[PDB]
Design an enzyme around this catalytic site. Sequence first.
Site, mmCIF file in Angstrom:
data_model
loop_
_atom_site.group_PDB
_atom_site.id
_atom_site.type_symbol
_atom_site.label_atom_id
_atom_site.label_comp_id
_atom_site.label_asym_id
_atom_site.label_seq_id
_atom_site.Cartn_x
_atom_site.Cartn_y
_atom_site.Cartn_z
ATOM 1 C CG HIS A 298 38.592 34.517 38.305
ATOM 2 N ND1 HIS A 298 37.600 34.411 39.553
ATOM 3 C CD2 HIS A 298 38.511 35.735 38.083
ATOM 4 C CE1 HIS A 298 37.345 35.436 39.788
ATOM 5 N NE2 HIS A 298 37.866 36.536 39.059
ATOM 6 C CD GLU B 35 38.836 30.934 40.055
ATOM 7 O OE1 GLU B 35 37.737 31.427 39.999
ATOM 8 O OE2 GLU B 35 39.742 31.294 40.739
ATOM 9 C CD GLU C 222 36.119 34.445 43.581
ATOM 10 O OE1 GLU C 222 34.997 33.686 44.384
ATOM 11 O OE2 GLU C 222 36.079 34.280 42.333
ATOM 12 C CD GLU D 55 33.913 32.329 39.462
ATOM 13 O OE1 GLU D 55 35.096 32.274 39.655
ATOM 14 O OE2 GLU D 55 33.212 32.702 40.439
ATOM 15 C CD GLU E 151 32.232 31.912 44.405
ATOM 16 O OE1 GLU E 151 31.089 31.786 44.726
ATOM 17 O OE2 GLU E 151 32.568 32.833 43.493
ATOM 18 C CE1 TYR F 158 49.279 37.345 32.201
ATOM 19 C CE2 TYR F 158 49.680 37.087 29.796
ATOM 20 C CZ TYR F 158 50.076 37.712 30.947
ATOM 21 O OH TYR F 158 50.560 38.723 30.686
ATOM 22 C CG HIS G 180 32.229 36.310 42.836
ATOM 23 N ND1 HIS G 180 33.092 35.214 41.935
ATOM 24 C CD2 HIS G 180 32.075 37.319 42.113
ATOM 25 C CE1 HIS G 180 33.371 35.822 41.204
ATOM 26 N NE2 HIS G 180 32.688 36.922 40.880
HETATM 27 FE FE LIG Z 1 33.968 33.438 42.509
HETATM 28 MN MN LIG Z 2 36.712 32.995 40.881
#
Ligand SMILES: [Fe+3]
Ligand SMILES: [Mn+2]
Lengths: 326, 334
Positions: B133, B99, B237, B130, B203, B139, B240
């Site tokens: 992500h 990411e 994604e 990103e 990606e 987390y 993206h």
């Molecule tokens: Fe992405």
């Molecule tokens: Mn991503």
Amino acid sequence: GLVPRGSHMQADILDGKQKRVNLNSKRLVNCNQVDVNQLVPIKYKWAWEHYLNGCANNWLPTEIPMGKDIELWKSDRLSEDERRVILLNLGFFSTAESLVGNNIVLAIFKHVTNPEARQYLLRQAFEEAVHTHTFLYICESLGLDEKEIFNAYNERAAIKAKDDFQMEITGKVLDPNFRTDSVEGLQEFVKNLVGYYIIMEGIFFYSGFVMILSFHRQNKMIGIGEQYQYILRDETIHLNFGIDLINGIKEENPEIWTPELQQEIVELIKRAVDLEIEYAQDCLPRGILGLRASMFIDYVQHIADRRLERIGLKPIYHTKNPFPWM
Amino acid sequence: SSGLVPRGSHMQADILDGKQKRVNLNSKRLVNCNQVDVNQLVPIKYKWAWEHYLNGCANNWLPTEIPMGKDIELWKSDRLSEDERRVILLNLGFFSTAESLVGNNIVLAIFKHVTNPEARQYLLRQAFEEAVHTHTFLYICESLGLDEKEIFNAYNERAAIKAKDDFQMEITGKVLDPNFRTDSVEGLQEFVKNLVGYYIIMEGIFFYSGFVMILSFHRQNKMIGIGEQYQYILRDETIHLNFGIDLINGIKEENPEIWTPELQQEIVELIKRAVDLEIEYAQDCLPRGILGLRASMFIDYVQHIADRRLERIGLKPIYHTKNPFPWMSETIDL
Ligand SMILES: [Fe+3]
Ligand SMILES: [Mn+2]
Ligand SMILES: [Fe+3]
Ligand SMILES: [Mn+2]
């Protein structure tokens, strides 16, 4: 503190664990000894916290109803002087958000060699895109000539003067040959940070906020007002982050913070105050209910003093705040 | 907004020649656009870019909104096998830094050269996504009490992960050279290869064996917190990928002289190499089968998705394999 068998990944590159980042080698600028792509371990907890706070402030301009605003705008109730304030503020902000977001990406991000600070920058730049969307949305809602509004910084002298100053204070940070690994280079970079965080976001924007939020207080153009309230919440964090970043770079690179650099910053802030006063005079040649240009002479000086103190400089104006509600 | 324009509702210019800088819609271009002012969003030309931006903005989420209690209980239990744990850890390892690689390339390589404000609006949304992500993997690590340094350093410690990211670095090309420019055929071809490397390969291929393995667990009711976070990452994604395809196709359309038989072949070969590395990564994740998953299934799957990516940028499919995971094209409700 016990975990099941197989809860660790086995390395098969035997020298690879050496690339794990030592927290204490991390730096805000000029940090090439460690891997900038790994977020962890986070050193600058203030940067991470600003990132989290920003993320909790999600909003979209399209969530804010504009019905009452459109109805007011199309009516004959607003004076031409009131319309002038609104139009000049939309003209300035419509492109200023773009200037800020472009500078983050094209000037700042490369040289802030730290992943948690870069996380915040990505949030900030996205927030500037939201602010741009806001101005588009306002223009479409009210049926304004969107080209006339967005081109304002090329058509109105007091707006052009602010953004020409902004171009000057941006410095040579965009040049392919610009580097921050000299005292002079890092001083130039810090001047760019002061230009965008302290001056554009911290002085130019706060003055426009007062004009628009003054309408909101009068129950006029409340939809625009509400959008500006969300923008102000974001800009408060943008400013706090920028001050933290400036102060952090100073602390780690005390050789940049010369009496000479300090005076240069003071001089740029004075020039910004003078430009913002000129802009307020262009917005308010006669003054409208609740707003006169003389109030802005006091207000702009007052906020300039607050920004100066935050980065370790003496206040210079000593004016009172005529807008306590801000 | 269909009422009369009221008197006094126009702002008056005091710089008479300034009106010349209003942007003509037909002068806007995706790259090499110096003829018009890039700082003005209006008028929007590329409606597809603006639509992607609005769609992305509608998809707001945060990893901290997704409860991890059940995943913690399961991770702490003996009900997850050592082989299942290896799939999770390798995927976290890979995604944790991937990411940041994608986001850094958007800001440091792509944004400068995409000379169009509506596309740049989408780019700023993408780069922020990103960051979301990246936060997600922090987390997950903190939630499960994993060693964060071990996970984020995986791409330097695990050969099959390093092989993918080393390939990525190579396909980045010379776009980071501060004197790199897109104002020649060669420059623009190199820029398009970067777009292919990040949108189509990173990606659009390298993330997919990972999505399959993690979403397979979610379907089995295992680690459903991680699964839900991966569902949100997948939704992002997908946008993206669609944007990157639209951008590559738009650049081609506006500059058809770059899309030579030589460039076309170079792109195919890059995609073939990516397929080989992704298959090797799936074999590293799955030395032995787990329910509904075997390394061999990824030969067909990775080749199937590579064919789909090729078609979208006007290249012929080359593998002709079937899709072992057709449930992946099932509309998920989030
Ligand atoms: Fe992405
Ligand atoms: Mn991503
Ligand atoms: Fe800001
Ligand atoms: Mn802003």
